[PDB]
Symmetry: C5
Subunit: 364 residues, 5 copies
């Protein structure tokens, strides 16, 4: 394939990494950014230092998501190159240590919701942590976190079982389909490691979200659900849908395959003579990447998850060149990241092997 202007590698080369059992030079240079420099690299230390996040101005509320998306990408690195599996394991150990620091979960207390980030609700945080415990153990074969993983999985299963709707809230009375999708995927990973059947609750969840929470004609989820009133916020969200369909594809591929083409019709604008694409965050607008500004970046991951090389290429042509990447001393930096979680999501999308393939990761 031709290398498009301002791109670091072809779409062909990203998709061929697993078959070639090697990451591209630019993915290796991202792993150098993540690992190389003393003190300021994100995976320097298991300690509760956040220098790397302070230098890139990560908002405190988003650090949990930065760590989790790096972790999901490290899981795929483990599957692509057996020679990097040991380093991916070490990084996932650090990702879990950091994820447990109060800098990361502390907004739960500061917002007045409680002192224990695990106890009830707060699925945004404990969903990602529970999936990271699982991915760490698939990659390493280590039981370092097994006691905590066993405990968190049961709290999540108990909370689902107790609730009259299918799933768990974040803040009291804030239900989001995307944070539930991570928690359910965390049960599939636990079942793969332990031979359990926590994943059985998934069928009732996929029935529930296909009623009030989706517009099936547009293949788009509504912004949020609030059980106390039963209110559904009447705006569809592209970044919400992209994330949800990506994770659900690892659990019920038919569900995400049913809605993906309607999702693209609803939100994806192809432009620049077919070379590029950008994603509208909601209906009734021409504007790309409104709201949190992550529709195009989450759609890049969804395109990778669904095997859509054409939309992957169009989106990366939109996202990467204006961010002006360069490799200095074999380490990747972007001069003009276009969004929150920018290096994280471009990393994850370049390497992502599929949530199903991570579930079925062979032992070391």
């Amino acid at each position: 394939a031709e290398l498009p202007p301002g791109r670091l590698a072809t779409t062909e080369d990203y998709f061929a990494q697993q078959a070639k059992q090697a990451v591209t030079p630019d993915v290796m240079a991202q792993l150098a950014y993540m690992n190389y420099i003393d003190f300021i690299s994100p995976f320097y230390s298991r300690g509760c230092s956040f220098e790397a996040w302070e230098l890139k101005h990560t908002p405190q509320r988003v650090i949990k998501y930065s760590i989790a998306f790096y972790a999901y990408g490290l899981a795929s690195v483990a599957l692509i190159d057996p020679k990097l599996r040991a380093l991916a394991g070490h990084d996932l150990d650090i990702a879990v240590s950091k994820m447990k620091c109060k800098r990361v979960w502390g907004d739960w207390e500061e917002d007045g919701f409680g002192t224990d980030p695990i106890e009830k609700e707060n699925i945004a945080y404990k969903g990602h942590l529970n999936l990271m415990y699982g991915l760490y153990q698939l990659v390493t074969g280590s039981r370092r976190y097994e006691a905590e993983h066993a405990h968190l999985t049961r709290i999540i299963h108990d909370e689902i079982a107790a609730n009259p709707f299918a799933g768990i809230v974040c803040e009291p009375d804030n239900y989001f389909v995307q944070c539930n999708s991570v928690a359910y995927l965390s049960l599939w990973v636990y079942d793969r490691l332990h031979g359990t059947d926590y994943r059985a609750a998934t069928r009732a969840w996929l029935d529930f979200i296909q009623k009030d929470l989706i517009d099936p004609e547009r293949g788009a989820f509504y912004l949020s659900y609030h059980p106390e009133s039963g209110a559904v916020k009447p705006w569809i969200s592209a970044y919400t849908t992209a994330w949800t369909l990506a994770m659900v594809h690892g659990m019920d591929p038919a569900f995400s395959e049913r809605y993906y083409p309607r999702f693209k019709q609803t939100f994806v604008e192809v432009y620049d003579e077919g070379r590029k694409a950008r994603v509208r965050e909601t209906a009734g607008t021409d504007d790309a990447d409104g709201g949190v500004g992550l529709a195009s970046a989450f759609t890049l991951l969804l395109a990778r998850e669904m095997g859509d090389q054409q939309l992957f290429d169009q989106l990366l042509n939109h996202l990467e060149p204006p961010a002006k990447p360069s490799i200095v001393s074999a380490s990747l930096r972007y001069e003009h990241p276009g969004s929150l979680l920018f290096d994280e999501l471009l990393f994850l999308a370049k390497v992502h092997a599929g949530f199903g393939a991570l579930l079925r990761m062979p032992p070391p």
Copy 2:
């Protein structure tokens, strides 16, 4: 009017027809998107004691209680306009009551050294708005989530009125404002409507009392404030004081507002630009518009809406909205140059307001 004036988002006829068509205009929907859409920073994201939405628009602490109350009054009319938005409006009103109880909102009462309990006595500015929000939440949703608190706060207000030698309650100790009383008395009308009680009976003594030292009947205007310890009435008339008070009273005694409304307009409203616009003088003996707190024009927009005055509504919105430079980006409404405090709140409320009488008569869910 049916032509779209320059810089306007929708016609005056469109705002006034929302209830008949059982749909909000797209710009009102885009305001509801501003209020509800973006994680953490939207004002109605969470019931938590987070105020990011207010930090980002530099709302002064002492005004946050007013921002929340005005959003709440707007959301009660949205519930009446479009039955499909009623559950969302109930949700937002639940968040508005929760936030209203955060110490960031009422904390000025302690920090000014007046006490540690914002409802115990006085402080009618804060607890009048809270008590009206308890009522409007329960009319919109039929939920009794707040009934215990509502039953308590209504009785504290009724007891304080009954105990005072003057009709009503003070804010700070010894500071009486007619506009903050007007909200407290409306809260008793809403409680009575829900419970079949007669707390609203004290209204007649109040309406009799404010028509004495506190109003200029000829100019149809209220003086700034009353100070019972000294007997002092501050000797300046206030448009924003008058506009807000006439709007709320029109819900309880429409004849009272109808008598003073035309004289209020003569006293304060400047029509300009060949009849296309209007701006409101805050006090007498000046040519300057929107002096003082800067809210005379905005509160007159609400009054015009309440009184069914489409011409003045159009004129005021032509003055207020275009220079604020509205735009809709990703189906969400933003103003580049808000002209005043409480700007999106008061323009939202005025665009949807069904009338305080219609909110009192709101059918069940």
Copy 3:
């Protein structure tokens, strides 16, 4: 008939005629609007311990007590000018006493390590003004709201005077200033008017003491300060010190001030601009105006009003007001470029000031 000078809001004739016409000038009414109008940020919005008005004008913490006191002194004269405004003056004065008692105002006493109680001993800068304000509040309102505190503070002041070997009371330990004493003594005259006591009897000994080493009688000017531990008098004369002291002493011993006033003018006052303007040197051996704290001209405006010197009042107001760029926006007064601390306070007080003697003799209020 009188001509409105360039940049002025009203003639000197109009300010001096307010009491006779029983009405403040529109610009004085617009100052009372500034003080009373806007929720939260107007200085007399609430009796609470909020200082938003003083934050907005960058008033240094140490000067807030003076700002409140000078507002109070003006409001007392407003009560005298226009009976219809007397209730409003009374309400503002109630607020001024409440704010005066907030620790934001008196707190410097603790912060500098002098003690936790601002009225116990010394600190005459604070409790002189507070004692005078207790008095004027009661003269204006006829209210006994603060009578208990006033009786206490008056007796603490009299006791401390009686117990010192010099005539009067210090501010900081070992810092004696005639200007802060003049306020304390005037507070005893006001208590005496209200209660038919004779605390004012100590005034004679004070007027004899301040005319030994504390004055240059030939130049009609007080020295900066006295320090009883050493017996040192700082050897510089001060115009703002003298202007303030003579204005207050004129309400107690008019002959004392009538004696020194012409020498004070020759020493300090520079008439300029073909006789239209005047500015005041702060000390001797300089051509420079308004040095030091920078209040010589503004305190001399008050003195000119107190002495009935319309010519010097006009000249000083022609120097002070036009460069401050006054404007009335929505019937409320603002200065773009205040020339000094306490600027709107001291111009308000000078425009309305009925004389400290007239304040002493204020008739009681009309019944409810």
Copy 4:
């Protein structure tokens, strides 16, 4: 005598102040700066308020020296104009009060050396405090600090007696001849007031500093001595030498008279056709006023103490004009003070009657 460009008064006028029993108008304007304006003048209040030093941006560690040097100048004012002796005594009472505030000595604790600044060592602080006690009592005849003075003098005498080298350190293991010189002068002032013989220890100290601590060829002291190691830092210091010789001239005039010509030869650069002088801080350089930047200012004091009118004029012609003095409302300010302790040291040099003449101050 001709007034040089940018000068306020002639060298002749400064040196004739005591004979005329009057300070120059410019020294009077400095006393106005020190005393005039409420709260911000350095001598407003005996309280622990340091507004004046905050506005000049005095470093915390330097406030103790600024107070001492004002005090040394106020002692000479007392001798020059009897009419100003009560003012100088008042100012000296404030100087001593302020000297005892934690803002002034608190570096001793912050640096972890102790919570009591007079207990042991710390001679920089307590040598200046002890001299100030004595000068306050010579000027005023007041016994207000006599108890403290009697205690501090004995603590200093005890520490000298207990040390195997002649003198006392500042920080532990840091010996400086210039901070010792102040401590020894304080013993001469206590002896003048009480008839004691604490000054007897001075001959041993002068014998000592003339061994390892001085360079006899250059008439210059080395920067410092370090007892634990025996190290003498191998650089000569002009500001060290000027201050030390100025103070020693009050105790042993022949000593300062012996080194003074060599000191000038070594450090003093005459320039501008004989009109100006500037002082090198160390050997092996052409640069003036390196190090702490006080060589020229302390040499102005030394020239005054030694009666050297020519070098006094040359140094003040270098120091004062560029600092752009002005007298506004009979008060002195410099727009461009060229060093730390600038107004303090120019005040002191202008008034200084000699440490010997301060020793012999007749009573009030």
Copy 5:
């Protein structure tokens, strides 16, 4: 030898310092920077004052390395000039005192790792402290810290003896060869002072670091080791290698002699017609001095250690001129330091007599 452009002294003059028994005038001006100015010179006081490091903006985490590098230089100054041996001893006393201030070690606690910086792990701090204890005693012959030295050496020996890998970690689970190299050298110094055999553990360490931790053909260490996972971060580090080979050369000169020419092949770029050289920090890049930016500075020290005058000259021609050195008042300053630890590492490189020579230092 010709003085190259922008240089203060020839390479010939640096290397001949020991033979001439004198430091160059620029090395003496660096010692004047380190010692001269009251309060702000780094070696002014033994107390917990860090103004010198505040003024150059040293990151908190780098201060320990700044003190140790100065210490390593001062030890060679002792050997070069007997007349400066006492001043060097005094400075090393201060270096050890400052090293024990919580400003220096406090990050151990701040990062959640413990309240005691020497109890376990944290080899980066206690390796340097232990080397400094030993170098202080070699230069001075003082037993002032012998109790602490005997304690710390034993803690280091016990922790080596307890680990299944050869050596000790920094943070938990962070193993760096360069930080170990300092710890082992500290044992050689202890053994030199006491006749003990703690250095016997070195052979197992040198065997361990030549397995997965080195690319023997490129003469380069990988960035780090992480025993819990067994991961080696898969990037070679020039700065890691230059520091490690320098310290090892004093313990096993054959080890460093074998790798040095392969190291230079791998990382060193000679440019400007053979006159200059700059060092690449990792493989697969043309960029010089990436990462922590110290590759060139550490290679300067290694060239000095290996007696490679040609590469020393080339590196100093790259590092020193762009930094615009000047001598003002006989004190050295750099207008544009090119890196962290700049004046520290150029001082050490200029004086370094070799770690082997410091081991063999004869008594005072």
